[PDB]
Specification:
Chain C: GO terms for molecular function: DNA binding; structural constituent of chromatin. Chain C: Heterodimer of an alpha and a beta chain. Part of the relaxosome, a complex composed of plasmid-encoded TraI, TraM, TraY and host-encoded IHF bound to the F plasmid origin of transfer (oriT). The complex is a heterohexamer, with 1 copy of chain A, 1 copy of chain B, 1 copy of chain C and 3 copies of chain D. By secondary structure, chain A is an alpha+beta fold. Chain A has helices at about 10-20, 45-50, 85-90, 95-100, 170-175, 180-195, 220-230, 235-240, 250-260, 270, 285-305, 315-330, 510-520, and strands spanning about 5, 25-30, 65, 70, 75-80, 110-115, 120, 130-135, 140-150, 280-285, 310, 340-345, 365-370, 375-385, 390-395, 400-405, 415-425, 430, 445-450, 455-460, 465-470, 480-485, 485, 500-505, 520-525. In chain A, α1 runs antiparallel to α2 (about 45-50), α5 crosses α6 (about 180-195) and α11 packs across α12 (about 315-330). By secondary structure, chain C is α+β, with helices and mostly antiparallel strands. Chain C has helices at about 5-15, 20-40, 85-90; strands at about 45, 50-55, 75-80. Chain C starts with a helix and ends with a helix. Chain D is α+β, with helices and mostly antiparallel strands. Chain D has a single domain, classed as Orthogonal Bundle (Arc Repressor Mutant). In chain D, about 55% of the residues lie in helices and about 15% in strands. In chain D, strands 1-2 form a two-stranded antiparallel ribbon. Chain D starts with 12 loop residues before the first strand and ends in a 6-residue tail after the last helix. Classes of the chains: A alpha+beta, B alpha+beta, C alpha+beta, D alpha+beta. The interface of A and B includes residues 384 and 388 of A. The complex binds magnesium ion. The site of magnesium ion has 3 residues of chain A, from β9. Magnesium ion binds near residues 133, 144 and 146 of chain A. Chain A binds a DNA duplex through β1, α1, β3, α3 and β6.
DNA sequence: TTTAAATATCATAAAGAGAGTAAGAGAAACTAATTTTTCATAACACTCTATTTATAAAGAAAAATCAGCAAAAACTTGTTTTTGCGTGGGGTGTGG
DNA sequence: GCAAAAACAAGTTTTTGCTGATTTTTCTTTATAAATAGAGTGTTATGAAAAATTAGTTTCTCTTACTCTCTTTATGATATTTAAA
């Protein structure tokens, strides 16, 4: 059996895979492995260096994105067999029946992509480190080896192993498709050696799988998975996988021999070897009266306990509606009288065509760079934008300044725009980024009960206990938050929320109407168009009352 | 009279430096001379002149209006000796 | 310090402006001052001082290396009067 | 030059400022070519931006008539690069290039 | 009037904007050729794109005159040539097609698949 | 009888396809136009002979108008032959005499 | 008894318009960033003078910066050129 | 299926050392110029705040390029009918 999984991070696997004498020890192989001069034994530091991108040669395959190395380390090519072989190798059957069997890695699909607007090239070799494991995750006997194939392959130029989501012509696509074929490729060699060793072989079921009585007893993981689940099976396997626990090899042998007390055969080698969505519309022409009525209806909905969401398009219109909503809630008493003030950071979107353009950088805004060493963002405030050197001057919380050329900015930098906002009893807030100290994430709808000009009472969703946040008057310590009473059309999806929306005479477009219905079960739409003339736009899937 | 604002505008027009850049640069240009005179160095601006520093002994000064003698305290002063080139451009600089 | 050292200090403090641009700014400021003096005009910078031209009437003269007397033409000469802040900062006595 | 050079001008629409005595030139060109005023201005701006990247100039001084120019993505990037390279605001750079193209090439049918 | 050609053009159907002064002339040429109106327009345009890859424009001859729209459905090669000319000239696809059709009507009033050109 | 058909042997079918497709005209309209052209040019049409009849005959349809139908009716007095002859034989003669024919002013090319 | 026609009648396929969509025109309004005006307000100027301290005069050397240039180093522009998702999958259920 | 990060060639701007050019610094004795305390009076540079204003973006009404769909003759084949040898 070969189970194939994607390695996630170099730092994880480098320590994980490097960490009864074991099986035999660690190893490595590959037709391209010997080119770098590394064979057999492989050190921990070099293994993690190869996983992150540091080749034994001078090449470097690191790919920095979002402040982190997004390069995929490689693919884990595992090799495993039923409990029969592990029970054999427990006698201590020489182990090599599996090690040489895997040492089928003697790679036909190995290829790299080399453009010239158009192509793959048959490199045909790679560097694969093989780590030998003795038991399963239940510590029950299961001899298997993880052959970690790093995403590093040598046309005389190094490149990552081929991948292509469209076309599926690359190495990884073929390996994933040929999973069962490669499993059956491995399947044969153990029996081929056993034909000289004379032990029993027999097909057991699906896909020609072949596999001594205690074999059923040593399959606790398979039995538990079947009990829990009755392929995407994978969820149960991930959920029920306990972490590795240390066991003394002779104590483990004692436990195995005691638990297998009754059903068995040894005395097998003694003889066998002798081998030789509704909607409703209201019409109000003027913005002031329409917003006042909409906000009053929203406040009435909030008072009775009905879940409601405000909805307008456009930033300025959103601000106006938010002001009206807050005023009407204050009249209704849902929002508390003693308002306070605080600062917050709202994200500014950037991309490749824009982050090298000076026009969107302004003094008074915040820049954060993810420090890979401190594992936190260093916060700066832009003090100067200079055209003569195309350079921003950034000031830290300590007050020192540094000059950075715009051509040297990249995805590691995040640009935020400071803002100010009032807060009172019952205010609704949206988290816009990785808020420190909380598992809350972007878009989450926090609620605040009370404030004391120095700290806030906030209800984290699902925490069921009052968490507290600081009040800050500086960009360097402001929270990545926003007010969440009025949202953007189609921003959030809800199957039951009522959307108290307002639409102008020109926002009736298809996308706005589709997102509006998507935002909730029902919409109490307020329209700028005349009564029953706004209903002309209802020639769509959403229905009237 | 010539003004820091006038020199700032002149730098803006002839070099393109931003208004903040020109203002800060002229203010720093004056402040650096003030600091270099504060710490006792001589400033030799070739083509314009020298800012020598002179140490003065006490003198028997007086109040000219009342005639009462009031001693001049010993002090250190800045003296500007124009160079040869600047004087040539100024010899006929009639207002 | 000389002019080059002054330019170096200004460039070091003003990191964003290139050194060549700072040198050009210093030379242009000096030329502006020299031209304003040549135009018979007064320079006044609060906290630094004032530049002005004073008339010298035609007078007698002598060549001290030989002693021969030579009368000269009347001409203007530059003069400098330090400001309050510069006087306080440059002096080291009470 | 840098009358309003520090401002942000990433938008796709330019409220072109024209002297009242070249608005007549633009209207005449529009009538002769059939193009809308914005079309004529934008296409002449593209032509000038491609032909002359360096546009050193001495810098009107009368009443001004404002017109709406709706650039496309390619013209907007070139114009922003040019305004950053010259220090002028987007309106002034666009007006200078449009006026130069109008005076030098009176028809521009290509 | 004539707008900027911002939108990308890849569809095969085009609404030919012909001045009412020249719609009748195209109908006359069509009954001269024995070909259908729309097919006459297509067969004119596909060869006009061949004869004059570079095409100087007329100076808004009709302008304020009324216009009528004719349904056109082009083939792949004609569509490709038209889009190439549209990108090389900066007008919209409708205006480029209309102007080239008018030019081919004026120059060759009895065009016959590039082998015979004109009689009137 | 507005509908009448043309006896076209196998050999002339390829020539008709070539001439009509290069002309950019449909088969029916091309047939009617060619028939009217041959009727126009030779009002004194005489026996030409049915030489091609040594091949399998195929029919191409057409729909006449009043003018051409009456012209064929009157031309059938000139021959005493069948109406399929009156329609087809002159069409074959025109197809072998004037391919590449836009109008009367443009000659055989 | 065929057969050479005579005249319908469905099948559908280049045509040919009506409607919907979404984006361009053009004059208009809003918004905040840059520019010019207004306005304190303290620094500057001038006078009163008895007397102590500097510095032009010139002119030919020592010498002390400098600037223009030639060469390299940082740097931006435009264009290729490599990568990564995410996958599929037999069991013995592994690979944070 | 496409960005986005990385390599690479191409100028382009900014910095850096060299060496003659160019400007500075020295010395001789003698006259005026300048240096200056306090105080009063009137000017004037100059930074803060405010008002103007203008670049930039968003709005409102209309129009029409571009596409989809509904209708229509047009081309054509299948089909029934018919007069003569
Ligand atoms: Mg393992």
């Amino acid at each position: 059996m070969m189970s194939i999984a994607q390695v996630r991070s170099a730092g994880s696997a480098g320590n994980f895979y490097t960490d009864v004498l074991g099986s035999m020890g660690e190893r490595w192989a590959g037709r391209g492995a010997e080119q770098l001069g590394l064979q057999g034994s492989v050190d921990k530091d070099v293994f993690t260096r190869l996983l992150e991108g540091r080749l034994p040669d001078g090449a470097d395959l690191s790919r920095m994105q979002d402040g982190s190395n997004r390069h995929r380390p490689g693919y884990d090519l595992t090799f495993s067999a039923p409990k029969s072989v592990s029970m054999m190798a427990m006698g201590g059957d020489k182990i090599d029946a599996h090690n040489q069997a895997v040492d089928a890695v003697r790679e036909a699909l190995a290829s790299t992509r080399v453009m010239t607007g158009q192509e793959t090239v048959l490199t045909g070799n790679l560097v694969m480190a093989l780590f030998n494991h003795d038991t399963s995750r239940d510590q029950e006997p299961q001899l298997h080896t993880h052959a970690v194939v790093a995403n590093v392959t040598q046309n005389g130029e190094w490149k990552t192993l081929s991948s292509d989501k469209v076309g599926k012509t690359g190495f990884i696509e073929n390996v994933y498709a040929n999973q069962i074929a490669f499993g059956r490729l491995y399947r044969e060699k153990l029996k081929e050696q056993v034909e000289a060793l004379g032990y029993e072989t027999e097909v057991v079921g699906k896909h020609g799988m072949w596999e001594g009585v205690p074999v059923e007893a040593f399959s606790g993981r398979s039995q538990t998975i079947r009990e829990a689940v009755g392929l995407k099976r994978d969820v149960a396997a991930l959920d029920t996988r306990k972490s590795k626990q240390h066991v003394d090899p002779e104590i483990k042998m004692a436990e195995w021999m005691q638990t297998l007390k009754e059903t068995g055969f040894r005395a097998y080698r003694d003889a066998a070897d002798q081998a030789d969505r509704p909607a409703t519309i209201i019409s109000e022409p003027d913005r002031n009266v329409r917003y006042a009525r909409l906000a009053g209806d929203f406040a009435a909905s909030v008072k009775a306990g009905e879940e409601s969401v405000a909805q307008v398009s456009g930033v300025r219109e959103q601000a106006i509606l938010t002001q009206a909503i807050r005023s009407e809630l204050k009249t209704q008493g849902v929002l508390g009288l003693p308002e306070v003030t605080m600062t917050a950071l709202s994200p500014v979107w950037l991309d490749s065509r824009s982050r090298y353009l000076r026009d969107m950088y302004r003094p008074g805004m915040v820049m954060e760079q993810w420090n890979p060493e401190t594992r936190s963002h260093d916060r700066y405030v832009i003090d100067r934008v200079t055209a003569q050197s195309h350079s921003l001057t950034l000031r830290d919380a300590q007050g020192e300044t540094q000059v950075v050329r715009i051509s040297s900015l990249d995805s590691s930098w995040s640009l935020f725009r400071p803002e100010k906002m009032p807060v009172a009893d019952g205010e609704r807030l949206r988290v816009t980024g990785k808020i420190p100290g909380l598992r809350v994430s972007g878009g989450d709808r926090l609620q605040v009960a009370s404030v004391s000009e120095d700290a806030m009472t906030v209800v984290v969703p699902g925490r069921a206990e009052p968490a507290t946040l600081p009040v800050s008057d500086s960009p360097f310590t402001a929270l990545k938050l926003e007010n969440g009473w009025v949202e953007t059309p189609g921003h959030s999806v809800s199957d039951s929320a009522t959307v108290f929306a307002s639409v102008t005479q020109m926002a009736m477009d298809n996308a706005t109407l589709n997102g509006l219905a998507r935002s909730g079960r029902d919409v109490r739409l307020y329209s700028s168009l005349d009564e029953t003339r706004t209903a002309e736009k209802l020639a769509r899937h959403p229905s009237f009352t | 009279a010539l003004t820091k604002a006038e020199m700032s505008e002149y730098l803006f027009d002839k070099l393109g430096l931003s208004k903040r850049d020109a203002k800060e640069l002229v203010e720093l240009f004056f402040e650096e001379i003030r600091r270099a005179l504060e710490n006792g160095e001589q400033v030799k601006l070739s083509g314009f002149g020298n800012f020598d520093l002179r140490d003065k002994n006490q003198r028997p000064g007086r109040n000219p209006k009342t005639g009462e003698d009031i001693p001049i305290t010993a002090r250190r002063v800045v003296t500007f000796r124009p160079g040869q080139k600047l004087k040539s451009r100024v010899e006929n600089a009639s207002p | 310090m000389t002019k080059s050292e002054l330019i170096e200090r200004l460039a070091t403090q003003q990191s964003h402006i290139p050194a060549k641009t700072v040198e050009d700014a210093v030379k242009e400021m000096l030329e502006h001052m020299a031209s304003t003096l040549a135009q018979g005009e007064r320079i006044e910078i609060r906290g630094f001082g004032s530049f002005s031209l004073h008339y010298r009437a035609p007078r007698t003269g002598r060549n001290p290396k030989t002693g021969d007397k030579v009368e000269l033409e009347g001409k203007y000469v530059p003069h400098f009067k330090p400001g309050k802040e510069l006087r306080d900062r440059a002096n080291i006595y009470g | 030059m840098k009358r309003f050079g520090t401002r942000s001008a990433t938008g796709k629409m330019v409220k072109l400022k024209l002297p009242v005595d070249v608005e007549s030139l633009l209207i005449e060109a529009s009538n002769r070519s059939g193009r809308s005023r914005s079309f004529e201005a934008v296409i002449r701006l593209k032509d000038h931006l491609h032909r002359y990247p360096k546009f050193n100039r001495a810098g009107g001084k009368s009443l001004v008539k404002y017109l709406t120019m709706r650039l496309d993505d390619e013209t907007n990037q070139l114009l922003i690069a040019a305004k950053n390279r010259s220090g002028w605001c987007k309106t002034d750079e666009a007006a200078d290039r449009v006026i130069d193209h109008l005076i030098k090439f009176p028809d521009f049918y290509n």
